[PDB]
Amino acid sequence: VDVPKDMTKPEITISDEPDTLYKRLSVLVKGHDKAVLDSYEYFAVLAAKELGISIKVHEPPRKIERFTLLKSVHIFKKHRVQYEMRTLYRCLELEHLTGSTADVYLEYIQRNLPEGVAMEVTKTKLEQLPEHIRKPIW
């Protein structure tokens, strides 16, 4: 029943600089276990739907790295022990995302990133022609 009344105090100063428009934002998460990435996709999709982003999710093909090492510590080169590192992929595309909405979505996504995965963002910012090109100069 007893709660801290009005414990919210953030400020959002709306300046005069025009916002940056991103044509399309691509997020590619890579990890070792599918289950973590499967849950992470659900978290990203659920948050994206609530913000109204209309995202699409696809799974790029995986790649497997293998290498071979000797077994014993002396001679015996006919017996090998192999190892394998598996990197599973998952891509989340974002379309028609403004700069202001991009900042909050990415930082909210990045802070909740699990320890066993990492991600790369490819932002396709769009803008008009340069002043020299736009303004007629021969």
Binding site: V1, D2, V3, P4, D6, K9
Partner: protein, 173 residues
């Protein structure tokens, strides 16, 4: 008046100006005691759960005030749970708190369902006396404490347990 003081404390980050630990304990000591009798026990219990033990640990006198509120509110079914929380809150071996609980449970006769609950609590209280940490210096069993425990294990269908209590009166004089 206290709610306006407490309401101000919970606004924004004003809670960081409460003071030190002993000041925080003292601030909630006086405030919680006011919550006992000035308000209905139904809302007092809600504040008891929220404030304790998350914010502060109750003092022995504060437990006495809570017991008084229950007695005035005509509710003795919560007494066994209070004793269980008392041990968790560092009041396992408080002589002042033990006497109050034993007197209240055995003050009046109760239906068998409620009497068994007091008997279970009394047995736990009896075990605490057996394993006091003051036995190294001096173990003391109060005269009142032995009497109420013996009386309690009579009406709960524990006549066999009452027989062992008869010999304690002569052993402790």
């Amino acid at each position: 008046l206290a709610y306006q003081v407490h309401g101000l404390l919970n606004t924004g980050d004003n809670w960081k100006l409460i003071g030190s630990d002993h000041r925080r304990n003292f601030y909630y000591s006086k405030f919680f005691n006011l919550l006992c009798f000035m308000e209905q026990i139904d809302v007092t219990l809600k504040w008891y759960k929220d404030l304790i033990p998350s914010v502060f640990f109750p003092h022995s006198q504060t437990m006495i005030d809570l017991l008084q509120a229950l007695d005035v509110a005509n509710r003795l079914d919560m007494v066994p749970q209070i004793w269980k929380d008392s041990k968790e809150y560092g009041h396992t071996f408080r002589n002042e708190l033990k006497e109050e609980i034993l007197m209240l449970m055995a003050r009046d006769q109760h239906p068998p369902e409620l009497q068994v609950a007091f008997a279970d609590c009394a047995a736990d209280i009896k075990s605490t006396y057996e394993s006091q940490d003051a036995r190294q210096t001096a173990p003391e069993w109060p005269a009142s404490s032995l009497n109420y425990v013996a009386v309690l294990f009579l009406r709960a269908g524990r006549t066999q347990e009452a027989w062992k209590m008869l010999g304690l009166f002569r052993k402790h004089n």
